[PDB]
């Protein structure tokens, strides 16, 4: 399955687990940030590769970052 | 019009197309009166009834030629 | 007519070391993916995002590279056999006259000297160079076979290959006989690859057969 | 009940034979009904298309009916006997099935079907009636004048 | 009048269930050819469906083969039958070798054993089929 | 009621947003960030549905936008005419068809390209035409340079009316949506109206101008002593004494006395041995006839009054049991959805083209367009690439329809969703028939190829080697040459000498000849047959696959045009109908190519050339094609490298331009893959670096560049691919037909 990660320049501008077509991502509690929140991927198996969380990225470089990695039927998306 | 026979056979088909045809359901052929169709229709009845009837009669007319019928 | 080919040669060697050079130095990253180093040397793409992608990991650099590799040897060895070629007939005048222009190249290289290759068989008969002809279709073949692979990407290919598959497993009979490893379009990088070996194995077996076959057909 | 009453004729049945027959005896009829029917549309446009379009067996073979299949060789007679029996082991199956309704190798029991299938129905059934009458009468023609139905109306 | 619907009124499987795919012509035709057929063992499957299949096998090499206009031409489409039939019995092993392999219940098509079974028949019904079809194509002139 | 309804003043005539440049589209009129925005307000500059969402601004705009068209068409139109009128040989070539050549076009001497002013008979200097418009004059009977200059004339008075009419209205009195839909009336007039009077109209305009002035001609009467149409229009005596039929007036037609105008309303069928081409008795009767059939069924739609039809009962009325509810919801469709309407008209105006095509050679409609040689490839090419780009735009506009205007609230279980909830099956079952027709057919010119260069031509599909015989087309042709005795009696001749009969030919040259077919053509057309197969696979799938997919569930979400969805699920790359349709203009560009090179090929192997007074008949290539174009071998080597002499051989004569064309078209043809082979990422790292050099200087711009789109990238490689591909071949027919015919 895919890596992915989120680093600490995330903003909480929760657009990732929006454009997230899997409900791969979503918002956790957090310090760093003012709106208090971070992207998180507890569910990194679910995970496809469209990168459209890298897409809704808002930051000059991205926060949310996807690895692709070894391939599984989830992750190759086959309804086969 | 020159021929007594094509006069006939016009009028014959000007009149069975008008007798036969049906617009929106009503028609002399499907009982519908002639005070009605008047009515509902006007005109429209009497010009495309008979151009239709013309529009045959031609056909009719034109076969009978070539055929040595007339 | 030496001067201009070599400066064409001298313009395909600079292209070539272009590409080779910005691929190895943007290995490591790019102001499009600085942390291209991360992803490695050969990876599809990065995505739609950022304007899109395409052929961005260094490997897609070899790939580009690799047609102009094909393109400056072609050139060289068209040079190279033209040239020897009208000097071994006593001829060098026409090199001297037509090879100053792109259409007496068209014309007095390859449109000349490809009879004896193409009528290696033909409706009459068949010589020895039959062989030859039959291979400078079939690298022709090769090479627009590459072509498909090149142009055509995944995504059409995947969805064909599903409709195949929901055939396959509802049609009776067949049905009975089953993969095990379920079928899937080639990747990205795969189909570069294919198409890319399509491409210059049909170069070499459609350029050697005219290079052989027409030498020995002349004998000069 | 059935599909094959119409408006020329209603419930056509003078002598008796659906009251006091089984319901097996009235499947069996309307199955051979269906079968007549459809063999002898099939022999009626065999007839009418062979009499004056005949490309195979080189067009040698008459246009005659009655004298065509015996020109025919063995072994096409003997393909289309099979063919033809391999059609009727496919009935005799369907005949064994459960759920049989007389004729229908669609099913058709197994569907939302309405009025326009009963009418459809009908429609088969007429036209084969029709070509029952036809076909016979065909090869009466045949038998007589020894010329097939187009050149018969030559 | 619906005559095209759901697959065993599953509205939700990729299937139709259309005259062609559920008619009782499709279903009695497949329910009894050798492969669907009920109560037929996996060597009789395999030997109907080979003895089938070698007896058409031969003409197309019979008949289009290099040797077609040569006094061997049945003879060489008989070898051409034996040389492809051994291919598809060879075929037919690796598949059972690939699919099956851990299996232990046998008289099933799916399973080691059953699709062994299978292939044996296949082979001898089709190396059958191609010589039957041999010694009539020899006497022709019967028919 | 049907009735005008419109608004006055809906838009004022301003250059201010002449000035403001992406005004129409609500990204675009922010400004300009980087160079991409200069392309996307090409790509989205007519894209109104887009840019707004009321149904009745779109149909205005469209409305002008057609105005505009026809402003253009129209000075097209002027601009054939008058410089045939002005710069043109014509008066040369009426004198004399058959050894004049036609030319209208003139260079100037400027850099030594005067050399292209070759010697094209006469006494002029000019660059050879290829167009018909000179055959098409001697048709509608223009004799003289007045009257080409003054119907240019009327033609540019017609552009400027058409400007005029599209700024009318769009910006004083544009029309309303109620007025837009009325969708039956559009029928009726257009049916009665516009082709049905065209029709007559261009059928008086025969019978009283067309007929007495190319009878004269073919009698001998030079163009001066021609009465002029103005005198032959009322002179009853003149139009008697040609055809006496005309004595008898009107009466014979207003009594049912039609056999009277058995002269000039002729049905002889055939081409004319004077003209090779056909009868224009035989054209006017046909206009006339077409005239009442269109009036006839202009008159079926429904209007103000009781009468007529009506469209959506018409549908509704029409479902089956294997198709549920049937065409219910296609009139709503039809009626809201302008993409619909496009697909459907692009996909008859191109099958229309490639009928035209195909017929216009077969038989010559214009006098001396037969031996004509050039124009007849010219036509027949020209329109059936057209075609294949009309066919090409219908499948992608009815992707967008998918894409944009499709609901299932109007379409729950009609046709349309029935189609879509089995496009697996149908995109599979194609899929079989396009590897099945593929591998035989291209399997038989391989085998050939194969036991050719084995040295065993006794196995080859040939003519007398494995024979496969046309039998349905032989028996086809067998029949039309059948048909004027038994099934057409009034017919005297055939319809066309392609299926059999006597050999047309005027002086030397032979205008048409019968096409016998074997082997060779067996497997041509099921080669025709199988692209034909692959370009509607291609298409088929990118509009049943627009909504949705196996790979992708919400493809509609992202538009029509899209690049792809990420590498996820092994890569998603060209999952658009968009890209489905870049993909099938490759495979009708391949399908149109093969069928214009089996007509060159077959029309001068064995139709084109030369018959002697004796009855010898010399073909251009001598009837190579039966035996030649059984392998690919053969159609390289007696086709293209036999047939581009012509090109390379080219230079220092007036074909220059052509061989110079063939080398630029090549040029350009590999160019594209450029495009197509690469990707963004490499060349906007590329432009990243060239960005820095110029930062360098301090002179890198505001406007920052930026590599082209992945979807900008596909267009730009396949607009180059078709141009290059398309320019070599039009260099090389009309090198090549130039030179020998
Ligand atoms: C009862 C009176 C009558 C008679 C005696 C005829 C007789 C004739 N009509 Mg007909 N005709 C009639 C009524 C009649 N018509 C009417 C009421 C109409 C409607 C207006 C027409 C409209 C009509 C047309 C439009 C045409 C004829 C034609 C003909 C002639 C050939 C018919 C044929 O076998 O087609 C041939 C058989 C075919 C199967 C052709 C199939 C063609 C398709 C496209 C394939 C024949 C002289 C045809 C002709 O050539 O007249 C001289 C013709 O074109 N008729
Ligand atoms: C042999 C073919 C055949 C068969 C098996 C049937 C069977 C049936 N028809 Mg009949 N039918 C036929 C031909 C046949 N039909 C033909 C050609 C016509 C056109 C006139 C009709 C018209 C018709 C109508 C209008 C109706 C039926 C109906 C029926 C059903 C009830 C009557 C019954 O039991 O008849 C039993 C029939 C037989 C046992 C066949 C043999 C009959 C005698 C013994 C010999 C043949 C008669 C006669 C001598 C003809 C040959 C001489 C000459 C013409 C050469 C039943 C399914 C009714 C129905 O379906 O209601 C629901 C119905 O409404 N049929
Ligand atoms: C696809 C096109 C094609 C076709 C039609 C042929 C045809 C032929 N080739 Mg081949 N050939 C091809 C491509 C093709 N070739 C190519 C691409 C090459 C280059 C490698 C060659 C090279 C080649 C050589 C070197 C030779 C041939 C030869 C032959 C002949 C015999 C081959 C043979 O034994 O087949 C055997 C075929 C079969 C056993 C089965 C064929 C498929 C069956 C009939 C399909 C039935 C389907 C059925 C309807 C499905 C539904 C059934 C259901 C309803 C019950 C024959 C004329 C030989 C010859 O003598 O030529 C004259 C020969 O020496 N070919
Ligand atoms: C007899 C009446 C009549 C005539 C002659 C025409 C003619 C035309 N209409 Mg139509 N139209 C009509 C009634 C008529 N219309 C009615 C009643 C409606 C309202 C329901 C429309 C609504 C309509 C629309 C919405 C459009 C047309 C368009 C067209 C053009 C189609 C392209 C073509 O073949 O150009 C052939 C051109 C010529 C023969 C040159 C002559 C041009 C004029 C008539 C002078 C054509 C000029 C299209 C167009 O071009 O719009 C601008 C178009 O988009 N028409
Ligand atoms: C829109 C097309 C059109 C137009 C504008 C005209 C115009 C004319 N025709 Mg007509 N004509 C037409 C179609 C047309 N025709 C067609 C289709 C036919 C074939 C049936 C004829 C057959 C015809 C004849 C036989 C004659 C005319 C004649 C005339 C004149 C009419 C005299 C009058 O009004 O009384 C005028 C030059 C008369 C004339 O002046 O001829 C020189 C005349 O004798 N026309
Ligand atoms: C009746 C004809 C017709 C009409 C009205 C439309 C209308 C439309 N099409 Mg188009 N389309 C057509 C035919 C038509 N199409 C055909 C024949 C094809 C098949 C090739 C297509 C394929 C097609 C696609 C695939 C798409 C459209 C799209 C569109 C929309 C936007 C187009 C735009 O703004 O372009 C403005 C004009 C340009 C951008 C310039 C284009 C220049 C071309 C590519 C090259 C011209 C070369 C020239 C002739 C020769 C150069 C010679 C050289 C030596 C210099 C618009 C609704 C787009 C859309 O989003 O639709 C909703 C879209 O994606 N069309
Ligand atoms: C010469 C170059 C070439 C070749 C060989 C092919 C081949 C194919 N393309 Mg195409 N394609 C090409 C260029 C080419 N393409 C290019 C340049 C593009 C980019 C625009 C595309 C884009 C494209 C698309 C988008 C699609 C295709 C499709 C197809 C397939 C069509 C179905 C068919 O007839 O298969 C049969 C195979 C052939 C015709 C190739 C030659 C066959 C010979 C005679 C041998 C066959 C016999 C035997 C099995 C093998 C020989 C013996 C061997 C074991 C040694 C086929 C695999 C379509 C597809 O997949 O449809 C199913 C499809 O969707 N192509
Ligand atoms: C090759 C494809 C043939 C198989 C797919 C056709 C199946 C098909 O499309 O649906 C079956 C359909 C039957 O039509 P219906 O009577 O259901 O249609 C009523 C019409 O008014 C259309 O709604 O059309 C055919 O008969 C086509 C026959 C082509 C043969
Ligand atoms: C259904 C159908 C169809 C089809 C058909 C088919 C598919 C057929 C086939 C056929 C065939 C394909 C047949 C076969 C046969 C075979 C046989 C008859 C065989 C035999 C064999 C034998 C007898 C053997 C023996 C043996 C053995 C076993 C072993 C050892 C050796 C020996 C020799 C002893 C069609 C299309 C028409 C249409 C309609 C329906
Ligand atoms: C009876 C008869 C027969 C048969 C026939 C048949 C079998 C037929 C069929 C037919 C058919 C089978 C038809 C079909 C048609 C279709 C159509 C007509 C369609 C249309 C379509 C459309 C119009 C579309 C549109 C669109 C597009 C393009 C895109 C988007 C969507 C839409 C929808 C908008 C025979 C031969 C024996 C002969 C005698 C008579
Ligand atoms: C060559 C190439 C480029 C490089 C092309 C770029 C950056 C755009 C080039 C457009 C030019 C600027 C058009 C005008 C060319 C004129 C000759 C320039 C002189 C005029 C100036 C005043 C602008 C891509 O960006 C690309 C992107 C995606 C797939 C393939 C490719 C691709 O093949
Ligand atoms: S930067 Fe990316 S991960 Fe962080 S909040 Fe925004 S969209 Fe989510
Ligand atoms: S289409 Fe291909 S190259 Fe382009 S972004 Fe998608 S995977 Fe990468």
């Known amino acids: 399955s895919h890596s992915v990660r989120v680093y600490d320049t995330c903003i909480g501008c929760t657009q990732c687990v929006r454009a997230c077509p899997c409900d791969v991502l979503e918002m956790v509690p957090w310090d760093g940030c003012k709106a208090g929140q971070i992207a998180s991927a507890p569910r990194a198996e679910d995970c496809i590769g469209c990168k459209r969380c890298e897409t809704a990225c808002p930051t000059d470089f991205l926060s949310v970052r996807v690895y692709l990695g070894s391939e599984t039927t989830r992750s190759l998306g086959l309804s086969y | 019009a020159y021929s007594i026979p094509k006069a006939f056979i016009m009028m014959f088909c000007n009149v069975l197309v008008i007798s036969t045809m049906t617009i929106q359901g009503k028609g002399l052929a499907k009982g519908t009166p002639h005070d009605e169709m008047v009515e509902s229709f006007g005109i429209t009845w009497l010009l495309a009834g008979t151009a239709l009837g013309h529009i045959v009669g031609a056909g009719t007319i034109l076969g009978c030629s070539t055929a040595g019928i007339l | 007519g030496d001067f201009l080919i070599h400066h064409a040669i001298a313009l395909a060697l600079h292209t070539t070391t272009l590409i080779l050079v910005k691929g190895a130095l943007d290995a490591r990253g790019s102001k499009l993916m600085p942390d291209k180093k991360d992803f490695g040397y050969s990876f599809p793409c990065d995505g739609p995002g950022r304007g899109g992608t395409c052929d961005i990991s260094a490997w897609d650099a070899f790939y580009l590279a690799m047609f102009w590799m094909l393109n400056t040897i072609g050139w060289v060895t068209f040079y190279w056999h033209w040239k020897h070629m009208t000097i071994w007939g006593g001829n060098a005048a026409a090199f001297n006259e037509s090879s100053t222009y792109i259409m007496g190249w068209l014309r007095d290289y390859l449109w000349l000297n490809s009879s004896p290759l193409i009528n290696g068989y033909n409706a009459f008969g068949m010589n020895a160079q039959a062989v030859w002809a039959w291979m400078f279709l079939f690298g022709h073949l090769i090479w627009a076979t590459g072509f498909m692979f090149l142009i055509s990407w995944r995504g059409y290919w995947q969805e064909l290959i599903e409709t195949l598959v929901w055939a396959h497993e509802r049609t009776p009979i067949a049905n009975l006989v089953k993969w095990r490893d379920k079928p899937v379009a080639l990747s990205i990088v795969q189909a570069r690859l294919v198409g890319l070996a399509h491409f210059t194995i049909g170069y070499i077996f459609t350029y050697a057969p005219f290079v052989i076959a027409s030498t020995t057909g002349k004998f000069s | 009940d059935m599909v094959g009453a119409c408006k020329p004729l209603g419930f056509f049945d003078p002598l008796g034979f659906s009251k006091d027959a089984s319901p097996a005896s009235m499947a069996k009829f309307r199955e051979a009904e269906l079968k007549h029917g459809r063999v002898a549309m099939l022999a009626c446009a065999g007839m009418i298309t062979a009499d004056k379009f005949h490309p195979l067996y080189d067009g040698k073979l008459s246009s005659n009916p009655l004298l065509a299949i015996a020109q025919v060789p063995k072994l096409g007679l003997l393909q289309i006997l099979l063919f033809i029996g391999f059609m009727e082991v496919f009935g005799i199956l369907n005949s064994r099935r459960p759920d049989y309704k007389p004729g229908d190798f669609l099913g058709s029991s197994q569907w939302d079907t309405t009025e326009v299938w009963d009418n459809y129905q009908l429609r088969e059934l007429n036209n084969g009636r029709l070509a029952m009458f036809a076909s016979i009468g065909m090869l009466t023609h045949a038998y007589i004048t020894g010329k097939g139905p187009l050149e018969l109306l030559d | 009048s619906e005559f095209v619907k759901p697959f065993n009124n599953d509205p939700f499987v990729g299937n139709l269930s259309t005259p062609v795919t559920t008619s009782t012509a499709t279903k009695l035709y497949l329910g009894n050819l050798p492969i669907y057929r009920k109560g037929l063992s996996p060597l009789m499957r395999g030997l109907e469906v080979g003895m089938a299949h070698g007896y058409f096998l031969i003409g197309p090499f019979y008949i289009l083969g290099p040797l077609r206009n040569s006094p061997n031409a049945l003879l060489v489409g008989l070898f051409s039958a034996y040389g492809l039939i051994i291919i598809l019995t060879l075929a037919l092993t690796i598949y059972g070798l690939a699919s099956f392999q851990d299996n232990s219940t046998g008289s099933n098509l799916e399973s080691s054993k059953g699709w062994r079974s299978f292939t044996s028949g296949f082979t001898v019904g089709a190396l059958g089929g191609a010589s039957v079809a041999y010694v009539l194509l020899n006497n022709v002139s019967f028919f | ?741």
């Open chain 6, 1 to 741: 009621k049907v009735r005008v309804i419109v608004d006055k003043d809906p838009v004022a005539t301003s250059f201010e947003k002449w000035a403001q440049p992406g005004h129409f589209s609500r990204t675009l009129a922010k400004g300009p960030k980087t160079t991409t925005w200069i392309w996307n307000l090409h790509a989205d500059a007519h894209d109104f549905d887009s840019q707004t969402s009321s149904l009745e601004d779109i149909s205005r705009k469209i409305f002008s936008a057609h105005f505009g068209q026809l402003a253009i068409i129209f000075l097209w139109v002027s601009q054939a005419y008058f410089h045939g009128a002005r710069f043109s040989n014509y008066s040369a070539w009426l004198q004399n068809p058959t050894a004049i050549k036609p030319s209208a076009q003139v260079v100037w001497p400027i850099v030594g390209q005067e050399i292209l002013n070759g010697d094209v008979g006469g006494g002029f200097s000019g660059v050879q035409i290829t167009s018909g418009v000179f055959q098409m004059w001697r048709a509608s009977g223009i004799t003289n340079e007045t009257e080409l200059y003054w119907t240019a004339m009327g033609g540019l008075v017609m552009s400027a009316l058409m400007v005029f009419a599209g700024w009318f209205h769009y910006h004083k009195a544009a029309p309303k949506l109620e007025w837009f839909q009325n969708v039956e009336s559009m029928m009726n007039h257009h049916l009665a109206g516009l082709l049905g009077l065209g029709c007559l109209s261009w059928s008086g305009h025969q019978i009283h101008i067309s007929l007495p002035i190319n009878k004269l001609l073919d009698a001998g009467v030079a163009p001066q002593e021609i009465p002029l149409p103005h005198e032959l229009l009322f002179n009853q005596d003149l139009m008697a004494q040609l055809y006496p039929s005309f004595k008898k007036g009107l009466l014979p037609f207003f009594t049912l006395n039609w056999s009277e105008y058995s002269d000039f309303l002729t049905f002889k069928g055939g081409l004319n041995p004077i003209t090779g081409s056909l009868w224009l008795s035989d054209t006017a009767h046909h206009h006339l006839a077409l005239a009442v059939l269109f009036i006839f069924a202009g008159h079926m739609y429904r209007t103000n009054w009781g009468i007529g039809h009506s469209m959506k009962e018409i549908l509704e009325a029409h479902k089956g049991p294997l198709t549920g509810e049937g065409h219910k919801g296609l009139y709503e469709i039809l009626t809201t959805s302008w993409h619909a309407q496009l697909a459907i008209n692009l996909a008859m105006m191109g099958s229309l083209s490639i009928i035209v095509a195909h017929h216009m050679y077969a038989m010559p409609p214009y006098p001396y367009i037969g031996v004509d040689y050039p124009t007849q490839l010219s036509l027949f090419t020209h329109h059936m690439w057209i075609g294949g780009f009309c066919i090409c735009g219908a499948a992608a506009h009815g992707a967008i329809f998918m894409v944009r205007d499709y609901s299932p609230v109007q379409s729950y279980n009609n046709l349309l969703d029935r189609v879509l909830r089995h496009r697996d099956a149908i995109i599979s079952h194609l899929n079989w028939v396009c590897i099945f027709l593929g591998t035989h057919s291209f399997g038989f010119y391989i085998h050939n190829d194969t036991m050719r260069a084995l040295g065993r031509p006794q196995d080859m599909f040939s003519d007398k080697a494995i024979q496969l015989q046309p039998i349905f087309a032989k028996w086809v042709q067998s029949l039309h040459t059948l048909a004027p005795g038994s099934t057409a009696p009034n017919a005297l001749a055939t319809s066309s000498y392609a299926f059999g009969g006597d050999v047309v030919a005027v002086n030397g040259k032979i205008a048409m000849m019968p096409i016998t077919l074997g082997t060779a053509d067996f497997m041509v057309h099921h080669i025709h047959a199988f692209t034909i197969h692959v370009t509607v696979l291609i298409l088929l799938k990118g509009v049943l696959f627009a909504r949705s997919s196996r790979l992708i569930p919400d493809k509609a979400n992202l538009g029509f045009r899209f690049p792809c969805d990420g590498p996820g699920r092994g890569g998603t790359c060209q999952v658009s109908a968009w890209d489905h349709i870049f993909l099938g203009l490759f495979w009708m560009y391949n399908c149109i190519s093969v069928v214009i090179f089996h007509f060159s090929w077959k029309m001068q192997s064995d139709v084109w050339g030369t018959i002697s007074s004796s009855g010898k008949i010399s073909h251009v290539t001598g009837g190579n094609f039966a035996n030649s174009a059984l392998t690919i071998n053969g159609w390289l080597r007696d086709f293209l490298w036999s047939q581009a002499s012509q090109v390379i051989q080219s230079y220092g004569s007036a074909l220059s331009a052509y061989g110079l064309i063939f080398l630029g078209a090549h040029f350009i043809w590999a160019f594209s893959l450029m495009f197509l082979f690469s990707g963004r990422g490499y060349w906007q790292e590329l432009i990243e670096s060239i960005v820095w050099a110029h930062n360098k200087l301090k002179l890198a711009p505001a406007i920052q560049p930026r590599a082209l789109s992945i979807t900008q990238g596909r267009a730009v490689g396949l607009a180059h691919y078709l141009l290059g591909g398309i320019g070599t071949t039009w260099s090389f027919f009309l090198a090549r037909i130039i030179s020998v015919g």
